[PDB]
Every structure is written in structure tokens, then in C-alpha cells.
Design a protein around this nucleic acid. Structure first.
Ligand SMILES: [Mg+2]
Ligand SMILES: [Zn+2]
Lengths: 134, 25, 82, 221, 129, 102, 71, 82
RNA sequence: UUACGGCGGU
RNA sequence: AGAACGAAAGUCGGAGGUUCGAAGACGAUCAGAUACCGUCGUAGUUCCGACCAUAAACGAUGCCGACUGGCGAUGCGGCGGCGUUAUUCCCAUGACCCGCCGGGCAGCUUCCGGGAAACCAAAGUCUUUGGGUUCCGGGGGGAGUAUGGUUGCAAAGCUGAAAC
């Protein structure tokens, strides 16, 4: 019977996104925040919104919940925008290739150009897993 | 009534008017 | 694949197909030269032979027939001619 | 290209072969028989890299033909190719729709993401077929950097590179992003482009923040 | 067991143009299908075509264009008079402007409009539009 | 309405397969219609294994298997519940259910 | 389907003069036994004396005593 | 459509494709009309002129638009000629 | 395990 | 027109009779059980020689010919291939691995198309109608009946109306 309704779970995402900095992980303080910040019609859903807002306040400070508030929002610019490495994994100055893929860059007119030592794919044709049920 | 037990009752019937018409020689 | 120029193919793609069904038909056969080891004449037997062919002097086996392409018994002076 | 200005430029091929992109292996679609070279001994198919080079210059000619820069709807579904799209569109000024594509976006005109482009570009055809299907109705060309598996119904300038490798996907967005701004006035065509293509590669789990800052106790702390 | 090599020649064209293709392949030739195809070539529905000449009835590769809809046959080779030719038009042509039935005369394989100028009737051979 | 593409019977190029007889109700069905099941259950009822090893004279004695092939009529396949009523677009699949040994 | 051809009109005509015996309102106009069958006999009216007044019953949705005679 | 007096009597002349040369209708909403922007011979930059190609939606839905636009650019000023 | 039936027209 | 082979059941003659088992008997069940269940069990199954010519004899699709998508396979040959494997210590053959070709039962998919729709790569090439050619259907009942013909040891089959 504890399971929380939609219009409480709807009204919590509009608060905690928009007031992520004006909060805490305390139920009784965030109770007083939620009455100050939006008109709640009665006391029961006042501290029942506040309970679920606090249920995310011990939570969205840990993991990627739909938390597009500015402290999360600028944080992944340390990830996608930053982190250019000093060594390129496109540049090892040695790449090992196959005897036919130097045929492909022989008629691409490139066989005598770069370093490009080969490692021939071995004798085989043991691809294609043994078919059927066992 | 089925189709094959429509046959059997009208096969049992036609083997009677083949015999009552044969009765009156 | 709406516009494959099906009149000018690469002949090793045209080699893949049947002996019929080609843009111009051509057999998959040949005549071939056979010298029995220790003899003095080339024999010119057909590749898809069907009979137990004898030789001129050395009266022994020369080629043995099979399903498709008759098997030369002893490794002989052999090449695909013309 | 037809010129030497747009040629193969052997040094960047050392980034193709340092990202794979000659990788198929499993099998091939019957309408990508043209962009093949052979099957390996491994069962793997390798791709003639001048064919994926000749279409990629042809696909970049398509984007420059669009006047409005914020109009090429650049979309992706699989995870490798979600970091790549989001700052592709930040680089060349495009419109990114990343992650799960909401169905009924290009053309259901009521809700908020009613976006009507004039061109489209895809990471994977069969893994992202839902925008391929929907772009068939606003008569709108799509460009799908497709592998030998992925089908070719609603695509037009399909690039035959790769769609599954992590370093494979990010380079092909980089090689396309370097070019679309080179047909514009940005890259000076002789000097290289400064955006190192490691920027476009899919993100690891959170072991990041240990190892990068354990090589920064002589420059920060 | 190939009764009418004309009708197969035209069915090979009709299916392979609705796919949109550029080329076809007609396997047995005859001197009645090469004179068929040069009727719609001189009216320009198709273009170039080779007779791949083998010693028996060779093949024919027709470079299709995409001006064509249906190039069927009339499988009984009926006779048609000149008081009869006007009913063949409004049965199977799409209009009174364009399209052609083609009837083999005693003077050569011609159209319907070429035949009524020459004012000879003959046996109908097919129709194309 | 033809319900099934193959008509229940997985024959194609024949006229007559050998009619086999059902296992519990002894009803005559063709060989490829029958709901097959092959049972390699242990004979010992493996709750009852560490109650016989105290009584076993041997120390590493491989307990024998038990090999029964059940072959059913379709009428006593559903009522004894080896197969089950299904849906339209999940009929066209020839895969067995998952195993899950424990 | 159909044999066709220019010379086969004998087959296409001796196939039609006996597939015409299988639709009814032709067949009760040419076969003869259905011409004798009706009491008017190819006519439109007949006189006749009345032998019995009867009241038949109406069909399944109705319920009435329809009046008839026995001419 | 060039009547007896030779004046243009039609509503409008619609497009036609260049992959199968069919007549794209007023409701064939799978038919693109795409722009290919060439560059000048000297600097590899968008000089100001381009090319236009229509692809009918039936040949799009079939599968070979990429086979098409390769070939209908192949003759028309492209990278290859090889 | 047994377990059958349901007046006529709306 | 005409013939051949035709499951089962059936009929006639001779061997044989284990098992199952129409009919039948008996016990149960039931309001009633001439049914389901139970037990015993005849004809029949089983072989031989003669007959009958029907079945949901079903892919419920006449045969022949062409063209029109793809992919993964399975069966039979044939050709060519890294290799491992067989006596093989080398050969030539078999096993497995990768293909290609022809033919076969098929399969998965798709907006080629088609269809009343289920669905079918043929049930597609069809108001843009015409590749041969055979049989056959015309609202449902009365009817595969009545009569006649023929066939059959018999059962019945083939051919087949009409009144209403
Ligand atoms: Mg019955
Ligand atoms: Zn059963």
C-alpha cells in the first residue's frame, strides 16, 4: 500500500530539478522547503511530496537519475568536453595487418609507403559455430 | 446429422426400394 | 542491382556459371597430353574420358573413368593443351 | 575526389587501420557486394577503403549542399556513437537526437520534438531502423554509415565503413566532421584539424577519474 | 516446349522493366522478334540492342530505357481487316493518341498506322505502349 | 481457415509415415505428428542418493541413468501438459524452452 | 483455363452448348419438362372452378390465417 | 500539352526520376529531391553551384538508392571514373 | 467420477 | 474413346490363427447405457490366388514453358580449394573444413506483386485482361436420389435428372 502515486511522483521531478541547491537529505527541513516553494493544497500530500523528494535527495547525489540540474549538467563536460589524451590510440607507430589487406592497399597505391608489418591470419576456417542443437 | 450417416441411412433406404420394387415382379 | 552490364562480364565471374546459361556457351572440357613413364609417344586423351584407355606400346592402364573427369593412374607427363 | 585536393592522403589511412574499419567477417548484404574486396582466410570480409573514401566525400558534399547548418538531423541509437553525434553537431552546428529515438518525432506535429529536417544521417541501419522508416514520409534523404550486414531500404548515400567497433565508429564521425568543415572555410586544408579524434570515442565506466588524476600529482597537487 | 517465342520475349521485357532495370536478356532469337523490336525502337520506347550471335538462335540484350508500360502479345494470331482494325484499337490501346498494335502484313512487319497508310490488312502480332 | 503452414505433421515429400501408438492412452498417430519427449531422469530420485551411499558397498558408484522416450497424442499432450495453448505471432518458432538445470 | 486458338471453335462451341444446361432460367425455358410442369402451360391466365375454401397459415415471423381457394 | 494551336494546355508537369524514370506523383512521399554540392578545381571549397537528383520512392523502398546515386553520379563529374 | 434440458414474436 | 496400378474396410477359395478385436455375451457406470470404462471373445486381421475401384486418395492447389528478390542451410552428384585427419612411413582415395554448378524436399524474411481477407516468391506476370492444353463449378435444398445404360459373385461403382 506504500506505492506512491503519479501526481506526487510528477510534482517531485518539477521541484528537485529546479531547486537542487535549495535542499538537503533531511525530511523535516525539506518539508518546510516544499510548502514555501509551491502551493500544496493540504498537509497530507505536503509531507508526502517531501518524502519522495528526500527519497531522491539521498539518491540523485549518487547515480544518474533524471537529474538535469546544473551541478550534474555541467559535470559531464569534464567527461565529454574534457579528456583529450596525450597519446593517440590512432598512433602506435606500428600496426599489424594481413597479407590480403596489403593487397588491398597495393592497388590503393600504398604498399611502399609506411611501415605496416603483417601478421597473417592463420590456417583455419574454424569460424561458424557447430550448428543445430548439439 | 452428419454427412456419412446421411449416406448410411439413405444407403440402407435405397437397398429397400431396390428390393420392394423387385418384390412386385 | 538494376543496371549490371550483363553483356560484358569479367570472365572469371563467367567462369563460375554453368556450361549452358552463359552469355555465350562454352564447354568445361579440354584435351590433355599423357606420356606413360618409359614410353615414346604423347597420348592426347580427352579429359572427361569414359573407357579404360590403352596405350600404344606399353599396354597398361592410361586413364580411369569416374563420375566427371577420368583419373590418370600414374603421375604422367601431363598438361592441358591448346 | 576528381582532384588531388580531395585524394586518399596515405597518412590518414594510418587512422583507418588504427580503427579497424576494414572489418566485417560474419557475412555481407547482397547490395554491398560492390564495396567488398574479398573474404579473408578467417571468413572475415575487408572493405576497399577507396570506396568508403569515395562515398564519404560524396556524403560530405550532401551536407554542404544543405544551406541551413542547423538542419541535418543527426541520429543514433547504439551506445558507441552517442558521444560522437552530440559533439559532431556541436562541431558543425547540426541537430542531434541521441539515445532512444522517440517514435513519431520527425512528423507528428503536436508535441515538442516536432523537428522537420531536410537531410538525415544515421549510425546503423538495422539498429536504428525506426528513423529510417519515418524519414521515408517527409521525402527526406538519409545517410547511413552501414556495415556489410545492415540493410539498405531507406538509405541513399550509405557509407560502407563499420558500425560496431568503438574506435571504428568514432573515427568515421571524425573523418566526416573534418571534411564537412573543410568544404566550408574552417580547416585550412593543408594544416591539419586540431580536434584529436580520441574525442569521439565511446565512454568507459567510471575507472576514468582514478587513472587520469593519478598522472596529475605533479601539475595540480 | 516453347510454343510462341515472341510471347516469351515480350514477357521477359514486361517483368524486367517494372523492376526499373536497364538491361534484359531474350534467349532464343527469330527473324520475327528482331523485326518486332525495331518497330518500338524506331518509335523509341527502347534503344540499342545486340543480337548475341551464336550459331543457333542467339540471345538478344535490349537496353531498356523507362518509357514503357506494357508490351504484351495477342497469342492467337488473328486476322484483322481494315473495317476491323478500329475495334482492335479501342479494345487494347490506352488512347487514340499513342501506343501501337503491330500486325505482320504481306509487305512487312508494320504498325497499325503504317498499315492503314499502306492500306493492307494482315495478321496481328502484338501490341506495345 | 488453414491454421498451420505445415499441417501439424512435419512431413513434406511423403505419403505415409509409420503410425506409432501413444504412450498413455494408446491412440494411433503418425510418427511426425506425435509430441516427442525424451527423459534421461536418474533412476534413484536424487533426494534418495545420500540415503543409499551409507548403505552402498561401493564408494564411487556411478548411479545408473534411466532412458524413456515418451511419444504422445496431441490430445493427451495438452491434458498432461507437455505443450500449451499459444498466440498467433508466437506460433512460428521451432525453438525449445530454456533448460535451467537447478 | 481455356484451350483458345484460332482453329478450335468447335471445342469452344460444344463446350458452351452444354455448359448452358447448368443455369436455371435458361433450363426452365428450353428443356421441355419444365414447360409441361406449370398448370397454366406457357400461358398467363386460366379459368377454373372453386372446389374448397382453405385458410393457410403465415410464415415464421408473422402469424395470420391467409385465405385461399382450391381452383 | 501542345494542342492543335500549340499552346501549353496542362495543369503542371510533374517530375520524373532518374533511377527508373517513372513519374513521381503528387502523393509519392518517399521520393527525395537531393542536392549534391560540387567544388571548384583549385581549392576544394563550395564554389556556389551544385547538382540535383530525384529518386522515386518505389525504387527507394526496393533497396538500391545507393546503387543508383553512385551510378547516376558516376557519369556526372564525380571522384572515380575508375 | 456424475453433471440432461430451457414455449413463439420484440 | 480406351487401358495400368490403386491404402483401409469388404466379398469368394486355401493355408495359418500369436496379438489386437466389428458383432456378441457379461460386469460397472448411469434416470436410462443397446455408449465411454472393465473381462471374455466371433468375423476380420497374417500369407497365397482371384475380385471390388472408393478415401479429408489433401499442398484441400491438372500438367507443361518462361521470366521475376535476397539469405542461411539440409539431400544427391560434379568441379576447385587453406588445412587437420585416416594404413597415411609420402602418393590416390574416404572423414571434416570453404566455395561454385546443376537437380530435389523444403526454410526464414521482404511493400516485386497479388488477394474478400487469412496468406502465397507463386495463389505473382490480370479492366496495362490473350505462353500451351485437359477436366470441371453457376444461390442453397430436393440429390449423388429417381429412371435407364453398363460393370459387379455380392456390397456397390461409373453416367445422372426433374417435379417441387
Ligand atoms: Mg463420420
Ligand atoms: Zn495420448
Amino acid at each position: 500500500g506504500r506505492v506512491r502515486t503519479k501526481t506526487v511522483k510528477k510534482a517531485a521531478r518539477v521541484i528537485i530539478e529546479k531547486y537542487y541547491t535549495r535542499l538537503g537529505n533531511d525530511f523535516h527541513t525539506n518539508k518546510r522547503v516544499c510548502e514555501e516553494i509551491a502551493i500544496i493544497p493540504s498537509k497530507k500530500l505536503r509531507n508526502k511530496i517531501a518524502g519522495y523528494v528526500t527519497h531522491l535527495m539521498k539518491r540523485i547525489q549518487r547515480g544518474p537519475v533524471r537529474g538535469i540540474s546544473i551541478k550534474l549538467q555541467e559535470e559531464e563536460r569534464e567527461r565529454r568536453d574534457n579528456y583529450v589524451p596525450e597519446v593517440s590510440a590512432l598512433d602506435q607507430e606500428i600496426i599489424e595487418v594481413d597479407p590480403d589487406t596489403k593487397e588491398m592497399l597495393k592497388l590503393l597505391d600504398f604498399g611502399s609507403l609506411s611501415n605496416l608489418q603483417v601478421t597473417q591470419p592463420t590456417v583455419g576456417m574454424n569460424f561458424k559455430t557447430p550448428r543445430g542443437p548439439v | 446429422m452428419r454427412a456419412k450417416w446421411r449416406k448410411k441411412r439413405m444407403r440402407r433406404l435405397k437397398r429397400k426400394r431396390r428390393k420392394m420394387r423387385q418384390r412386385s415382379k | 542491382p538494376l543496371a549490371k552490364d550483363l553483356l560484358h562480364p569479367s570472365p572469371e565471374e563467367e567462369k563460375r556459371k554453368h556450361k549452358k546459361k552463359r552469355l555465350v556457351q562454352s564447354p568445361n572440357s579440354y584435351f590433355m597430353d599423357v606420356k606413360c613413364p618409359g614410353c615414346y609417344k604423347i597420348t592426347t586423351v580427352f579429359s572427361h574420358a569414359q573407357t579404360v584407355v590403352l596405350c600404344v606400346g606399353c599396354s597398361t592402364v592410361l586413364c580411369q573413368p569416374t563420375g566427371g573427369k577420368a583419373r590418370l593412374t600414374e603421375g604422367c607427363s601431363f598438361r592441358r593443351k591448346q | 575526389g576528381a582532384l588531388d585536393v580531395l585524394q586518399m592522403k596515405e597518412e590518414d589511412v594510418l587512422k583507418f587501420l588504427a580503427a579497424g574499419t576494414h572489418l566485417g567477417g560474419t557475412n555481407l548484404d547482397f547490395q554491398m557486394e560492390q564495396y567488398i574486396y574479398k573474404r579473408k582466410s578467417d571468413g572475415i570480409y575487408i572493405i576497399n577503403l577507396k570506396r568508403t573514401w569515395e562515398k564519404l566525400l560524396l556524403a560530405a558534399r550532401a551536407i554542404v549542399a544543405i544551406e541551413n547548418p542547423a538542419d541535418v538531423s543527426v541520429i543514433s541509437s547504439r551506445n558507441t556513437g552517442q558521444r560522437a553525434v552530440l559533439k559532431f553537431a556541436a562541431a558543425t552546428g547540426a541537430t542531434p537526437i541521441a539515445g532512444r529515438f522517440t517514435p513519431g518525432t520527425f512528423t507528428n506535429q503536436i508535441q515538442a520534438a516536432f523537428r522537420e529536417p531536410r537531410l538525415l544521417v544515421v549510425t546503423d541501419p538495422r539498429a536504428d531502423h525506426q528513423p529510417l522508416t519515418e524519414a521515408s514520409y517527409v521525402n527526406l534523404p538519409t545517410i547511413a554509415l552501414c556495415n556489410t550486414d545492415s540493410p539498405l531500404r531507406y538509405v541513399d548515400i550509405a557509407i560502407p565503413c563499420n558500425n560496431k567497433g568503438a574506435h571504428s565508429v568514432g573515427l568515421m564521425w571524425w573523418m566526416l566532421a573534418r571534411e564537412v568543415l573543410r568544404m566550408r572555410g574552417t580547416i585550412s586544408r593543408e594544416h591539419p584539424w586540431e580536434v584529436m579524434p580520441d574525442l569521439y570515442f565511446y565512454r568507459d565506466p567510471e575507472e576514468i577519474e582514478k587513472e587520469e588524476q593519478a598522472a596529475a600529482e605533479k601539475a595540480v597537487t | 516446349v516453347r510454343m510462341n517465342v515472341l510471347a516469351d520475349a515480350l514477357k521477359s521485357i514486361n517483368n524486367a522493366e517494372k523492376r526499373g532495370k536497364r538491361q534484359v536478356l531474350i534467349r532464343p532469337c527469330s527473324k520475327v522478334i528482331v523485326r518486332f523490336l525495331t518497330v518500338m525502337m524506331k518509335h523509341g520506347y527502347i534503344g540499342e540492342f545486340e543480337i548475341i550471335d551464336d550459331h543457333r538462335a542467339g540471345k538478344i540484350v535490349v537496353n531498356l530505357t523507362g518509357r514503357l508500360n506494357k508490351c504484351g502479345v495477342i497469342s492467337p494470331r488473328f486476322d484483322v481487316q481494315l473495317k476491323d482494325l478500329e475495334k482492335w484499337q479501342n479494345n487494347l490501346l490506352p488512347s487514340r493518341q499513342f501506343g501501337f498494335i503491330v500486325l505482320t502484313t504481306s509487305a512487312g512487319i508494320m504498325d497499325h498506322e503504317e498499315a492503314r497508310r499502306k492500306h493492307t490488312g494482315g495478321k496481328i502480332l502484338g501490341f506495345f505502349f | 481457415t488453414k491454421k498451420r503452414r505445415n499441417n501439424g505433421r512435419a512431413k513434406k515429400g511423403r505419403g505415409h509415415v509409420q503410425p506409432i501408438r501413444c504412450t498413455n492412452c494408446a491412440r494411433c498417430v503418425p510418427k511426425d505428428k506425435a509430441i516427442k519427449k525424451f527423459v534421461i531422469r536418474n533412476i534413484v530420485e536424487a533426494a534418495a542418493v545420500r540415503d543409499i551411499s551409507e548403505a552402498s558397498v561401493f564408494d564411487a558408484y556411478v548411479l545408473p541413468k534411466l532412458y524413456v522416450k515418451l511419444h504422445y497424442c496431441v490430445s493427451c499432450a495438452i491434458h498432461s501438459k507437455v505443450v500449451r495453448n499459444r498466440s498467433r505471432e508466437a506460433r512460428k518458432d521451432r525453438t525449445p524452452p530454456p533448460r535451467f538445470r537447478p | 483455363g481455356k484451350c483458345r486458338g484460332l482453329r478450335t471453335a468447335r471445342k469452344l462451341r460444344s463446350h458452351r452448348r452444354d455448359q448452358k444446361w447448368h443455369d436455371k432460367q435458361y433450363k426452365k425455358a428450353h428443356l421441355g419438362t419444365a414447360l409441361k410442369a406449370n398448370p397454366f402451360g406457357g400461358a398467363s391466365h386460366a379459368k377454373g372452378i372453386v372446389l374448397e375454401k382453405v385458410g393457410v397459415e403465415a410464415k415464421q415471423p408473422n402469424s395470420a390465417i391467409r385465405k385461399c381457394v382450391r381452383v | 500539352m501542345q494542342n492543335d494551336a500549340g499552346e501549353f494546355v496542362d495543369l503542371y508537369v510533374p517530375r520524373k526520376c532518374s533511377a527508373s524514370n517513372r513519374i513521381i506523383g503528387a502523393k509519392d512521399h518517399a521520393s527525395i529531391q537531393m542536392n549534391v554540392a560540387e567544388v571548384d578545381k583549385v581549392t576544394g571549397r563550395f564554389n556556389g553551384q551544385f547538382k540535383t537528383y530525384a529518386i522515386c520512392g518505389a525504387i527507394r523502398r526496393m533497396g538500391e538508392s545507393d546503387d543508383s546515386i553512385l551510378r547516376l553520379a558516376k557519369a556526372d563529374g564525380i571522384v572515380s571514373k575508375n
